[PDB]
Symmetry: C5
């Protein structure tokens, strides 16, 4: 229970694979997701080599404690993975085949710039630290990388699960570490956002614009202030499903812009009333008639500009 | 502590059974449920054969570490099950009878299309992977599949708990896997939705239609905008109890449609005021009188169409 | 470490007791409660008998691993109990006295029909499964059933903690099972519901009835619609503290009924305005004056009927 | 291992001490708090005595499994404490000095009568049960009772951490039990309640009283009903931070009383409008002018009475 | 497995290092954060010294149970850290190099005075208690203190991770204790607060000031009372993201001040209506015209004063 000795001076290659069984709990605010998968490991340990003829077997099954196993860890996990060894098999030439089933909570940053029309690349970083005896390097066995067809992540479409085959080798506390990047590509199912948030938010805004066909200040004040309050409710609802970002987001940009439209509508309603009281309704009529065209036109142009800047 | 040897070349059959003791925490948003049950396992291990005359006893009792036990796992769990072995009984021929009590979280997708008048089939998948010495296959002992009479899932009716007797045998990462599908059929108790959400939502909508018997624009604006805000509160309440779906739901369809009715009622109230101010009340009167019939009639027809498309 | 052998063919009687130390976290929505208690067990093991005059020792203290202990479990628990053995004492005749302190999360259905004036019977079901060597039956030692005087369940009065002395003996998966029912009787402290929910809800309803002393349609619309919105807020608040039931609760019935009163008040306010506009105020005056008496009278009678149907 | 034998017939005295390292998560609704502390224990075990000269050591260190250690438990904990033994030192006469660091979630009832100007005495109850061989009694070593200077409980001032030196000795399940009461005295930091809840609540109430300087019924209805809704929001906010109590609380009393003031203000606004419509404004003017003085005066007197009854 | 003996009388120096791998869950209300890191320890044990010439090995690898390891703990953790030993290496002179990967929930108070433009110094306190055989003192190996480049704390900028090299040596329960202070300096990303909370809050306040260009009391009452309610919603939203502090926060001060502006605006709207009704509109006009300048000017000056007092 020391590492396999090198024949010359070569690093020990540990072949890896991850096969996804379950994907769940993608938490946008926490920027975490839970995973249940198979982790497969393979390496050459000559001390375990045997003759098939003499032994009368083509495979040898060991218990984890009986042999040397590389200390493989995940970089971006909350706590160490919950793992259960499934099988350890040794071929006559000492080729070890290790299989474990694990569950882990993974930290992986999300880009919310295009929310809710966003795509993400979730990462699972595999790592191994070298020992004083020898250097350990990781490799990808593409034959053992995959996912169950039933793997579903509520509210998302799973595109692919692949591995960057070339490890990132680097020094950490005067020892070599070898890191692999497993990538889960997902795209958000934006469907439900349209009848639940986007269209209700547009309906209340268009309702505030009916004030441009009314001379009644008291009815106008009621129309614009009431719909503004409903917009505040939606702003609060949206920001509870999202983390605080150093950058602007598409939904955040639209929500912010709609406040400007409420603010300018209040100015218009105030200006209209003021002129009416001052016995200059001809003026007030010109501003109100212009507003009927200006507000939807500027709203459409501003949305085209925003969609262009974000997509 | 290697698998039982084959007399010829056949696979080792592991007979299974699940007996439900408790069902709790059906989380609609998470699409999970918690289960507390008996897991029974049975297989022949002739290496454990004994003479009752020599050993004195008619049945031998073993500790899990003393004998070979098949590595049975659940596919769709969050974490590995919490299990406590209740008994391991070995009969003279070598037939093992294994009993454990376990608790587990189960991932099982839910179809919300007909919510809150929906039924679900929850799944518990049992799996075993084959070893090199021999192939292991799962079977259902129907005599050991069941549920306690007191098993209750708050807000649901439990219909049945059965197993698909034919396992799904397939290759996974160059070894055989034998999978069993245990199905828990449940139907939602829709009762409470009627006095708590459906009737309050209808009352506020009918209250907005009183604007069709009023010429007072300022009272009308108050009626339609205030009831709209109450509808937004209900929309938010409903969407918090449900996950985001790539498809429309019945409740979601009705909630969305009721916005259209509020939006068209605002148009009517605006059109009515505009004509009144323009000294054309005869027109306004014709539109308002038509609206008194059109709004409830189109609401009833649209609901018949929706109920038909969903049920 | 096999069960004690029978002198004739009799079942092994395991005397039980539960002494409550702490009661906490009664979750109405989850229908669970947490418990911290002593579990006492007593049975005869003749293999462990000793001479009192020869040994000098009146009692012998064993470690759990040194002797046979019955596998006692709880039926209605989320997960297996967290237990710590306190003492194991053997008397000369071989009578074993076992004591453990445990904590567990218990599933126990609640009847919300009379909420918040409801009483509940929480259950803790003890169970033992018979072995092939012999049948194990449970009994209650009333001397070892009780609760600490300081045991408090926030928002509830603890009435009694008793056990149904006769076990439920039945066959489960071809073996005998012996089940005991420990009952914790509690009654809800309804006090706080009166100044926090009931009286505020009545105040807003009575405020809507001031519309029956007003001819101002615009003020009336404001009175009835605003108070209705406040009632919706209370409806939502109440239903968050309760699970969804396939029956009406007492509070649910009152909350539902108050909607009818708001709906009929809107009809009255509409009818009054319509007649006034139609130059028939004498009529409107008769309906409004009748409403001043009818609304409080029908509200009182409907509440007497509801209280009678529920209590 | 067995308890230390008595020289005569005396009970074994176990000297105790608790040194607080961290205090966190005081949950008002749950009436729990989390603690991280040192637990020190000391007792004489003659069997472990040694001569310093022939040993060459003035102190002897032991592993917990090597010697007898009293089974000390906490009464008012959710689950058994998470403990790690730090040191076990034996002096020549066999005086054992035990030290462990533990973490526990403690149940301790809170008196909310004077909230948010309340003080609490949190308890940590230490207990030991007697064995058949001998009686075990607890004592306090005041030299080993204390707290780290950095111990902070968010939202509270920590006054003292002391122990009631005389244990409560009593019989439980036919064995004697020795209980110690460790008391943590804390006082609530009421500061934030003034600008966040108290003053905003007073501002909206005073805003409703502007209706006593207005003859406009429509504006008055808007003033009193809108501010009432804001008061309902604060009532809901406050009751979410508190458990349901069988007794009234100070904040609860004020919140309830403010509803009466809203209810009576609506009566006044109604009475004023009714008289105005009946062509008796002289009367209405007398009631409104009286209300301008009566409402603030009765509000001040009622608050003096409440503060007196509660403090 | 006793501590290394001193050559003279010197304390044992344990060199420490923490290398951050993950930072997550900075909870403002709980004043906690979770950390995943490497903990490195180094000390001399002469009993483990060997000859490198005759051994042919430069380093010897040990299992934690095979050698003496100092009991290092964290002061400000909720529960004991979850640790996994990575490596133990011994140099020929007997210098031990210990490496573990751990995860822990850390308690560290936060200063909210300047929120959301605040910076924090999070602490991780390392501690060791001296043994009876010898005094243990901690030191910092700056070569083994650091953080992964990918370390991200959502909503924060990570400035530095350093250690105070001089330990705090002190007596605690009649033994020496050696404490090290590891400091993680972070600054809040205030960006999102501007379009989500600050600007919406300013827009509603400016909307209330349009009442200074209106003579309509009923419209004015609607403007000031409706926006006040929206301000209450924001006050509640902000105080849910923050703990209760015995001091004013910057945001808390602004939120409180904005209430005064609403309260004085209601006084103005009331005074204006009263004078008009009293047939003194010339006066009312002078107060309203002054208010148009006074309200924005006093708001700007008060904000300059507040920003100055807090920054
Ligand atoms: C209020 C404004 C309403 C929002 C308007 C749509 C947003 C948008 O412009 O959405 C665009 C995204 C498409 O994104 P994509 O192909 O993934 O991006 C990759 C883009 N590159 C690689 C070319 C840069 O979604 C859609 O298919 C639009 C369907 C939603 C309709 C909403 C109706 C209301
Ligand atoms: C606002 C709209 C009101 C909702 C209207 C009822 C919806 C519906 O039509 O519901 C229908 C479902 C029945 O469902 P089923 O037999 O499970 O479906 C399987 C059907 N197949 C297999 C034939 C396709 O529920 C009910 O029994 C309706 C009773 C509730 C009445 C609510 C009154 C308010
Ligand atoms: C608005 C509606 C106001 C609520 C009216 C009280 C409901 C009720 O009638 O409550 C009745 C329950 C009594 O229950 P019991 O004797 O345990 O039931 C056993 C009944 N048998 C005989 C069928 C077995 O509570 C009370 O003692 C009411 C005291 C509180 C009054 C609250 C006033 C506000
Ligand atoms: C609306 C009503 C506003 C609340 C009025 C203060 C309540 C009170 O009078 O509070 C009193 C407590 C003091 O309590 P004590 O000394 O701990 O109690 C022990 C009392 N004995 C003598 C019975 C043992 O708080 C204070 O220091 C008051 C400061 C808060 C001012 C809030 C201004 C608004
Ligand atoms: C409503 C009032 C609007 C808020 C005004 C900004 C607050 C402030 O005055 O912010 C000042 C802080 C700077 O902080 P600093 O350098 O970290 O502090 C260390 C200070 N010393 C020298 C005392 C140690 O932030 C900013 O850079 C302001 C950018 C945000 C502008 C928001 C505009 C809306
Ligand atoms: Cl890991
Ligand atoms: Cl499993
Ligand atoms: Cl159990
Ligand atoms: Cl304990
Ligand atoms: Cl620690
Ligand atoms: Na190994
Ligand atoms: Na086995
Ligand atoms: Na045993
Ligand atoms: Na011991
Ligand atoms: Na050690
Ligand atoms: Na109004």
């Amino acid at each position: 229970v020391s590492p396999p000795p090198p024949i010359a001076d070569e690093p020990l290659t540990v072949n890896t694979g991850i096969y996804l069984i379950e994907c769940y709990s993608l938490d946008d605010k926490a920027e975490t997701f839970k995973v249940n998968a198979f982790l497969s490991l393979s390496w050459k340990d000559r001390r375990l080599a045997f003759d098939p003829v003499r032994s009368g077997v083509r495979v040898k099954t060991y218990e984890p404690e009986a042999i040397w196993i590389p200390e493989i860890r995940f970089v971006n996990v909350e706590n160490a993975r919950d793992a259960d060894v499934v099988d350890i098999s040794v071929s006559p030439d000492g080729t070890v085949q290790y299989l474990e089933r694990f569950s882990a909570r993974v930290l992986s940053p999300l880009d919310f710039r295009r929310y809710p029309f966003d795509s993400q690349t979730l990462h699972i970083y595999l790592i191994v630290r070298s020992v004083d005896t020898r250097n350990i390097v990781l490799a990808v066995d593409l034959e053992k990388v995959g996912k169950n067809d039933d793997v579903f992540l509520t509210g998302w479409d799973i595109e692919s699960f692949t591995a960057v085959v070339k490890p990132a080798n680097f020094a950490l506390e005067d020892r070599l570490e070898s890191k692999l990047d497993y990538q889960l590509r997902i795209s958000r199912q934006y469907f439900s956002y349209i009848p639940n948030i986007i269209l209700p938010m547009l309906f209340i805004l268009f309702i505030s614009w009916t004030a441009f066909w009314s001379t009644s200040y008291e009815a106008n004040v009621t129309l614009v202030v009431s719909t503004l309050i409903a917009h505040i409710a939606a702003n609060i609802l949206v920001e509870t499903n999202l983390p605080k970002t150093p950058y602007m987001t598409y939904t955040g940009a639209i929500i912010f812009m709609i406040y400007l439209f409420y603010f300018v509508a209040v100015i218009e309603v105030t200006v209209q009333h003021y002129l009416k009281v001052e016995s200059q309704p001809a003026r007030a009529a010109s501003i109100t008639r212009a507003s009927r065209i200006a507000f939807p036109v500027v709203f459409l142009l501003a949305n085209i500009i925003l969609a262009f800047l974000f997509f």
